[PDB]
């Protein structure tokens, strides 16, 4: 008595409207999403009639003066078999369904003219939404999303935007004990996606129901930033998300360097092997007060003469890495710099890893010390995972946020 494709569309709407995450449609949200769908307040008497019909026709359809899912599914079923499908359709089309009961294309991905070089970030409304969503599906209240709670959150989506086991836990700040995604790591992962894939982050906000909750296009969730000259506008379009590429020889200890951004104690990453290749790592640092998100993409270099794609070169700040305890290491950094970054406008910081080990001579012509002196570069930064200091990451973010 109710089509299967309609049940799937009604089971999503219920979850989106379940703002308390108690599997019930309480009095408040029902009246709220009545204005969202019909731009009129829900009359107090009609709600009683609804809750009277549901309770008498459906077993446990009304729980604690609130509508359950089976009560919600029955009501719209009752609407259709009484010649009132336009009431259900108004709800269905508000949550972005067409006549084929599938998500509308213009509803999922609205047109966004994004200038070349301009970055895309989460607006305040976008962050406020994603925080609210995090709270709803964090049932245990540990301030983290378990793999169970994560799947339940993206049960209203055709699929998760990322894996849980091989992505969000291995690329974002997680809880040390439970090993689960905290609110911070949750916001970090969305920040990453928003920057590198806008049409995807908006697509998923629609499934989650940002367009219904915020009562606006998901364009209101997206903030387009751009580094400009001195402007006297009222809207501060200052960036807050910077992408940092980490280049250098293989085994120079930069893969573990990126992963150390996420953990408090980086010392455990020494003997640990990385059985899952992660492209980008993201975390938040403080740069002169303002919160700043930095992305660390590690790019290994096999052969010295092997070319680098412009997608690998172009970034906000290049972190050239050499193994300080290796004589044959620095040679790669020299080549990469002179070829791609010497005549560039991208800030670049040379980092010598494994400074806990004995700093050796370099079999190159120039040593890292005077190599920077020749090209007016800041002196090489000695990095170690045993030191456990986040000073390097904050400088990387600082170099991206400021000249030169
Ligand atoms: N002593 C020391 N060894 C390190 C450090 N970082 C990485 N390593 C070593 O580097 C090896 C892993 O290399 P990896 O980071 O995967 O190479 P990469 O992907 O080119 O950066 C491990 O066996 C560690 O012993 C460090 O800060 N200190
Ligand atoms: N569809 C609900 C309101 C929105 O959840 C009703 O009319 O009962
Ligand atoms: Mg939890
Ligand atoms: Mg590597
Ligand atoms: Na609710």
Swiss-Prot record:
Q: What's the protein here called?
A: Mitochondrial Rho GTPase
Q: At which positions is Ca(2+) 1 bound?
A: 18, 20, 22, 29
| Positions bound to GTP 2 | 248-255, 286-290, 353-356
A GO CC annotation recorded here is: axon cytoplasm
Report the residue ranges that make up the Miro domain in this protein: 239-402
What Gene Ontology terms describe what this protein does at the molecular function level?
Answer: calcium ion binding; GTP binding; GTPase activity; magnesium ion binding
Lineage, please? Eukaryota, Metazoa, Ecdysozoa, Arthropoda, Hexapoda
Q: Where does Ca(2+) 2 bind?
A: 138, 140, 142, 149
Q: How does it assemble?
A: Interacts with kinesin-associated protein milt. Interacts with vimar.
Gene name on record? Miro
Mapped onto the parent protein, the portion here is 206 to 609 of 652
């Amino acid at each position: 008595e109710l089509t299967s494709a309609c049940k799937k569309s009604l089971v999503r709407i219920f979850k989106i409207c379940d703002i308390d995450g108690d599997n019930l449609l309480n009095d408040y949200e029902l009246n709220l999403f009545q204005r969202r769908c019909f731009n009129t307040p829900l009359q107090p008497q009609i709600l009683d009639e609804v809750k009277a019909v549901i309770q008498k026709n459906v077993p446990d359809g009304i729980y604690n003066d609130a509508v359950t899912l089976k009560g919600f599914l029955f009501l719209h079923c009752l609407f259709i078999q009484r010649g009132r499908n336009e009431t259900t359709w108004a709800v269905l089309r508000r949550f972005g369904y067409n006549d084929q009961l599938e998500m509308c294309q213009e509803y999922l991905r609205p047109p966004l003219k994004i200038p070349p070089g301009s970055s895309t970030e989460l607006s305040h409304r976008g962050q406020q939404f994603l925080i609210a969503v995090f709270e709803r599906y964090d049932r245990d209240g540990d301030g983290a999303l378990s793999p169970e709670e994560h799947k339940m959150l993206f049960s209203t989506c055709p699929a998760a935007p990322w894996s849980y086991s091989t992505d969000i836990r291995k690329s974002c700040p997680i809880n040390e004990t439970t090993g689960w995604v905290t609110l911070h790591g949750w916001l970090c992962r969305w920040t990453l996606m928003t920057l590198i894939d806008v049409v995807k982050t908006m697509e998923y906000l629609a499934y989650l129901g940002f367009n219904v909750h915020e009562n606006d296009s998901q364009l209101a969730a997206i903030h387009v930033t751009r580094e400009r000259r001195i402007d006297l506008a009222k809207r501060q379009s200052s960036r807050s998300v910077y992408k940092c590429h980490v280049i250098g020889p293989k085994g120079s200890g930069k893969t573990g360097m990126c992963r150390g951004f996420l953990v408090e104690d980086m010392h455990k990453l020494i003997g640990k092997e990385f059985k899952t290749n992660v492209v980008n790592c993201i975390n938040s640092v403080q740069v002169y007060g303002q919160e700043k998100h930095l992305i660390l993409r590690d790019i290994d270099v096999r052969h010295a003469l092997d070319p680098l794609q412009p997608q690998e070169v172009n970034c906000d700040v290049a972190c050239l890495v050499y193994d300080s305890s290796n004589p044959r290491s620095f040679e790669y950094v020299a080549r990469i710099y002179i070829k791609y970054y010497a005549e560039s406008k991208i800030p670049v910081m040379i980092v010598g890893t494994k400074c806990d080990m004995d700093e050796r001579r370099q079999d190159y012509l120039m040593q890292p010390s005077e190599f920077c002196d020749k090209y007016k570069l800041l002196p090489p930064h000695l990095f170690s995972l045993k030191t456990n200091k986040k000073e390097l990451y904050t400088k990387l973010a600082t170099m991206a946020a400021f000249p030169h």
